[PDB]
Symmetry: C2
Amino acid sequence: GSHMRLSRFFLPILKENPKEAEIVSHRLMLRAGMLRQEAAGIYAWLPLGHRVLKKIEQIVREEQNRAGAIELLMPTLQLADLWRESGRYDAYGPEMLRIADRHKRELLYGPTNEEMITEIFRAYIKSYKSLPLNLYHIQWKFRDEQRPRFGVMRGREFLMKDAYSFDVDEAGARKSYNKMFVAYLRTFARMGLKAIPMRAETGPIGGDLSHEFIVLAETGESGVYIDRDVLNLPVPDENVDYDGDLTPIIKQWTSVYAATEDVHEPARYESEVPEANRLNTRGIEVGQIFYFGTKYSDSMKANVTGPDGTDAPIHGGSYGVGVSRLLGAIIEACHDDNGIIWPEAVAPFRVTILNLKQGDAATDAACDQLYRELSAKGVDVLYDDTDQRAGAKFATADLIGIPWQIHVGPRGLAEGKVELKRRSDGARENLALADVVAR
Amino acid sequence: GSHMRLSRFFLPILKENPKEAEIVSHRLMLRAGMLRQEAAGIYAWLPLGHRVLKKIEQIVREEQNRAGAIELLMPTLQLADLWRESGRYDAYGPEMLRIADRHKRELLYGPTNEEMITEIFRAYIKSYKSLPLNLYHIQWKFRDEQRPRFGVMRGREFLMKDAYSFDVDEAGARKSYNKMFVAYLRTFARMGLKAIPMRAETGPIGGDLSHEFIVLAETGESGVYIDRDVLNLPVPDENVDYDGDLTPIIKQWTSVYAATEDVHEPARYESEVPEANRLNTRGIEVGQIFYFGTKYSDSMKANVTGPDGTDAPIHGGSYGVGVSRLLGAIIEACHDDNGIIWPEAVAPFRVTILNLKQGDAATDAACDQLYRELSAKGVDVLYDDTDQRAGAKFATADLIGIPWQIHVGPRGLAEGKVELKRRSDGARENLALADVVARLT
């Protein structure tokens, strides 16, 4: 169980709202000592911020692994000549950061990895017997966004989990897509979010294999239109049979209307949804699933021999979760006027011990014992042991969004008690000291 | 307890030695399906290779944290104007990868982070009361090596843990340095390595606060000169008191001659090292610790108010561990004619189950139940459930370096027996099917 004394940590709280922050998540990430801008759209993750980033990453990896995807890692830099194979090199646009090395070879900072994962696959896989195959990584990307804005939510250097599926045909690809559909429901639910799968912009094919998972938010950059029954639907549990038929889960989550502004058609919204169920708002895109078929396998000649002995190009899909963007989206969805309210699964620490009389022998000893006992038992524990008054300590503890606070003072200890406070709702309970660790 | 079936994994084994690989680590990482070259010196980490990389990373993290260092993350792209503050922008050389963004703003892919970490520090810290402070990250770096070579050992895009200490004065900085020296001894020992601390190149004003930690290996690029006695010294255990005097540990590890070629002096060597103890050999630099004083805090104005109430520049030090390079160094030190021999702490899996008659109802069933039981007991386990002959499975298991093998076949099972083989020495053991989990757990 991770453990830190605030005095041996690095957590620079800002007293004042930063004028450069336009939205609440950006404001709070800066105020709560989580983030520092290094260039437009390019950030250092300060210790508290990095802890959350890592919690998010691990939840994503866990669900990808559950769904059968296999983790690897591609480099940040890629050869232009690879992108020339697919014809994306000259068609991608100015968001692609192009680089020349000392030998004048043409490189780029990868904005995504379709060509590269296809290059890897086609080196090693030649039989339909290796498929379905889903390979993924969690890696830093760069898109040279014209106007970086909104802190971690519209920047340039961002962290993404990007997964790529390989199948013999469209039928198998739909099964691979369904696996990721289910994994994403579970991923965002585990973060305390209702990220709704919404039908999204398709490619030149058309079809129905394009969804964006969007958390409803009014500072959000995506316009959306939904049927409110979608917000009530049940998320599959951890025993979901990923080798089985997933269609019933998908049917459930798509049986009721949900579309982004790209594929939204005002006349359909009415023939399906009751007027009292209809809602038109805005949101943050945190996940994207997309079938692309033979887009890369045709141009890059990524073929496998089929059950019938003929070679044919594979069918692929891509699945992205914006891991660094999620820090912003989560704060947008989970805060109040006193600061952040971390869902437990993503919080940097689960409990903070607040010593209300720093230097008094009895309160110090009590906090020292709690801190030691909580860590011994696997609990992520922050000990606020700074030379600050109680009210100073409450405000910082509230701001940074730690799920639980333990208040320790001379007053409470005279009676053998400490106060336990829940951040989400302000529940408070004056407990015996010997009971508090049995949570 | 991590678990995988080979049929559900991605592990591209190469039959032949790749002609582009000049050294054993490079050859084996390609053969064992751990690595793919994407450009000169730039690699993708295939699933097996990535697993080992992450094991290495976590041991490094654990020892930094134990020593009181605090993890953050800096971005890979940095502003040229930051490097103009310190004067290093134009001094660094052609190994720096310069980049222009769409607005013609001047960026670079960070080769290191002294300027950036000092910039973060100076924004927030103003009192001597905040010190000592050591901030670190584990992040991808770029050095445009003129001639990338030797796979992960002399590439361009690489993973480093880099830490940076901040202190009021040189005395405090020496205490910060000692803590990292001890952390490094523990770090490399936990990976099954003897990464020897040796005196290394100092800066302008010289001194005694530069060391490199070097794994001896025939194919290494560092030339070193040591008293062989340094090879048998004791590594501090996990209960080392990082807030105490570490001077006795440092003294012991610096009591015999050990120097890289950059600072080696023949006269001193001959004088301090008995002839039969002298060893001049090659090695791989895996750790580097270096006190730089006020080099960045002078130019970048990172002062704090000290005990005397006056403001003065801080004293800093940098500490780098070559995380990706360590896969190469580990294999160089840990292999035989049949492939890799992973130390258990960095192995991608601890045990592999070799089904020697794939499709046989009883061998499948016994393998399936060993696989489930080992997972449950928290063991990193791989089950080679592929449709391949015994010889093929034996060759692949030896190659990829899994510490233990369980060989499960008709002939063994007739006796209710399985064979447990230890990769390191090839020691074999026939033992009951029930007793086998209990021996490994």
